[PDB]
Amino acid sequence: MSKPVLYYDDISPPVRGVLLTVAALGIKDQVELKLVRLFEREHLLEDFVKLNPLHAVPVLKHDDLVLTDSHAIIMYLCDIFGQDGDFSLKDPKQRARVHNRLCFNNAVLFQRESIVMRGLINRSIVLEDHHLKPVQEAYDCLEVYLTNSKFVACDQLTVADFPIVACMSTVGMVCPLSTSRWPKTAAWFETMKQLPYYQQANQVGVDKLKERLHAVM
Amino acid sequence: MSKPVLYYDDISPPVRGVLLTVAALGIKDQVELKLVRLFEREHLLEDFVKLNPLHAVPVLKHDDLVLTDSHAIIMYLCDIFGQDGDFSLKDPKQRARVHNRLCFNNAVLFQRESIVMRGLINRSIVLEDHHLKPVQEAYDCLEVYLTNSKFVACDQLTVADFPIVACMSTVGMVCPLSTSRWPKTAAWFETMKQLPYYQQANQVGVDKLKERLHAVM
Numbered sequence: 351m352s353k354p355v356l357y358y359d360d361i362s363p364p365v366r367g368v369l370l371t372v373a374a375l376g377i378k379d380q381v382e383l384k385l386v387r388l389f390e391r392e393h394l395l396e397d398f399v400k401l402n403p404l405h406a407v408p409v410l411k412h413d414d415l416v417l418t419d420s421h422a423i424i425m426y427l428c429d430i431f432g433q434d435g436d437f438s439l440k441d442p443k444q445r446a447r448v449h450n451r452l453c454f455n456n457a458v459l460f461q462r463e464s465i466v467m468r469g470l471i472n473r474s475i476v477l478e479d480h481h482l483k484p485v486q487e488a489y490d491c492l493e494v495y496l497t498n499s500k501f502v503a504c505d506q507l508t509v510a511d512f513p514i515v516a517c518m519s520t521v522g523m524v525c526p527l528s529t530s531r532w533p534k535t536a537a538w539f540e541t542m543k544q545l546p547y548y549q550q551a552n553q554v555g556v557d558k559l560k561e562r563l564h565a566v567m
Numbered sequence: 568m569s570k571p572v573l574y575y576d577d578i579s580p581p582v583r584g585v586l587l588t589v590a591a592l593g594i595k596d597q598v599e600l601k602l603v604r605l606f607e608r609e610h611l612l613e614d615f616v617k618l619n620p621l622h623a624v625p626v627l628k629h630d631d632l633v634l635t636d637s638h639a640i641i642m643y644l645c646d647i648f649g650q651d652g653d654f655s656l657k658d659p660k661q662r663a664r665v666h667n668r669l670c671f672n673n674a675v676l677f678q679r680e681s682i683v684m685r686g687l688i689n690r691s692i693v694l695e696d697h698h699l700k701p702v703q704e705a706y707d708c709l710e711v712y713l714t715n716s717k718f719v720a721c722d723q724l725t726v727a728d729f730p731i732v733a734c735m736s737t738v739g740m741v742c743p744l745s746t747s748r749w750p751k752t753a754a755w756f757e758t759m760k761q762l763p764y765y766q767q768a769n770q771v772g773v774d775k776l777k778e779r780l781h782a783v784m
């Protein structure tokens with residue numbers, strides 16, 4: 351009878367990875383949302399900093415549990431809401447396959463794209479090929495993964511596809527996928543855009559960020 | 568009867584997080600090691616790149632499972648070797664608490680310290696206060712965590728303490744902990760250095776890196 355509370359701003363790819371997960375698990379009505387707007391600096395308020403000293407979104411509070419990383423939020427939601435469904439992580443090797451690709455997103459893809467995007471928002475940068483090489487190297491890895499399995503972690507859609515597509519749909523606005531160069535990734539990307547919950551859970555926030563990018567450029 | 572194989576170089580903090588975990592779980596005799604030496608560029612050999620397109624250590628192979636992130640390796644080893652022991656992740660909230668701090672290491676602490684250390688090794692940088700501010704901000708977060716619990720994830724030692732101490736003992740060589748400024752973290756650090764397996768699993772590799780740092784400086 352205790353509902354997790356997701357502190358969020360959907361311009362954020364980490365947040366949209368969680369929103370995609372919530373919709374895919376069918377648990378929109380079980381997870382309360384609390385908006386923490388980055389542009390208005392609500393993530394720097396004293397209450398939120400006390401909740402998360404990293405002053406970042408997303409955060410999940412569930413009773414006394416406070417999770418402060420989208421990838422930990424996603425695996426936890428899988429454990430308590432998805433054990434007996436298509437997204438289950440009950441099997442140890444399947445859990446590790448999915449966790450391995452969550453780590454790829456958190457430590458590789460998201461790190462490299464947020465350097466580029468944050469720099470454009472804050473105006474540190476104004477786009478040499480040097481900036482996009484790390485992103486393109488991450489695309490190369492993703493292309494290998496999607497050559498060996500149909501989705502990022504295995505032949506079925508898993509929660510690991512959601513943080514990655516949230517990032518891909520963001521950095522794609524400055525480093526677009528070439529179908530000739532990354533054909534498996536381009537086809538996987540088109541497939542994820544056809545998921546019924548993609549528009550509400552990811553595209554809305556992507557559109558907001560695109561507007562901020564066109565204002566800064 | 569199938570032994571996981573850890574591809575490793577102990578100069579790496581991610582690798583040493585795993586070596587600490589292996590020793591703490593008491594499974595040194597169950598995990599085979601295969602040396603992949605970074606300085607000699609063994610991580611760029613065709614076989615290793617095929618195994619891991621990120622061309623990085625550590626990698627764990629267990630039958631057909633290939634894990635390519637230390638934090639995924641650590642949780643998997645917990646699942647298959649530590650279910651009924653002091654490091655167990657069977658409980659969903661405990662798993663999420665531990666995973667949350669693994670994410671902090673992978674996405675915050677390790678990211679910020681590897682920028683500084685890689686730059687010193689490759690000679691991109693030669694140490695303004697600008698470089699160490701992100702590390703000190705990560706120390707500030709760690710200090711909050713260790714104010715609220717005795718170890719990084721809860722009041723017991725968990726596998727999340729190991730990747731973090733591996734990083735702390737590395738970046739500490741250029742950004743040392745002040746006991747007056749981060750007292751809980753300094754005391755936690757001294758406590759981890761007293762673990763019986765710390766010298767072999769972490770200090771050996773730290774010493775090797777210290778020598779490379781003094782050669783480049």
Ligand SMILES: O=c1cc(-c2ccc(O)c(O)c2)oc2cc(O)cc(O)c12
Nearest residue numbers: 361362363388389390463464467468520
């Ligand atoms: O750290 C911030 C990060 C971002 C952000 C937004 C979209 C991305 O795809 C991304 O990788 C980062 O947007 C902000 C917007 C703000 O007003 C203040 C901030 O600190 C941030």
Ligand SMILES: O=c1cc(-c2ccc(O)c(O)c2)oc2cc(O)cc(O)c12
Nearest residue numbers: 578579580605606607680681684685737
């Ligand atoms: O990427 C590399 C990273 C490192 C490394 C070593 C110690 C650290 O605490 C760290 O954060 C990174 O050492 C290398 C050493 C090499 O010879 C080649 C490399 O690519 C690397």
Ligand SMILES: N[C@@H](CCC(=O)N[C@@H](CS)C(=O)NCC(=O)O)C(=O)O
Nearest residue numbers: 362363364405406407408419420674
């Ligand atoms: N690894 C974290 C990253 C979270 C993160 O960096 N969020 C950004 C937005 S994309 C944020 O809230 N930044 C605000 C700040 O850094 O002050 C996760 O996946 O949750």
Ligand SMILES: N[C@@H](CCC(=O)N[C@@H](CS)C(=O)NCC(=O)O)C(=O)O
Nearest residue numbers: 457579580581622623624625636637
């Ligand atoms: N998030 C990864 C990071 C692994 C990583 O970056 N390893 C470095 C050494 S610390 C490496 O092997 N770098 C070689 C390269 O990038 O070519 C993990 O935790 O396993």
Ligand SMILES: [Ca+2]
Nearest residue numbers: 379381382383
């Ligand atoms: Ca409601």
Ligand SMILES: [Ca+2]
Nearest residue numbers: 387389390391
């Ligand atoms: Ca307003």
Ligand SMILES: [Ca+2]
Nearest residue numbers: 396397398400
């Ligand atoms: Ca309040």
Ligand SMILES: [Ca+2]
Nearest residue numbers: 396397398400
């Ligand atoms: Ca208050």
Ligand SMILES: [Ca+2]
Nearest residue numbers: 596598599600
């Ligand atoms: Ca042996």
Ligand SMILES: [Ca+2]
Nearest residue numbers: 604606607608
């Ligand atoms: Ca040699």
Ligand SMILES: [Ca+2]
Nearest residue numbers: 613614615617
């Ligand atoms: Ca071979």
Ligand SMILES: [Ca+2]
Nearest residue numbers: 613614615617
């Ligand atoms: Ca070969």
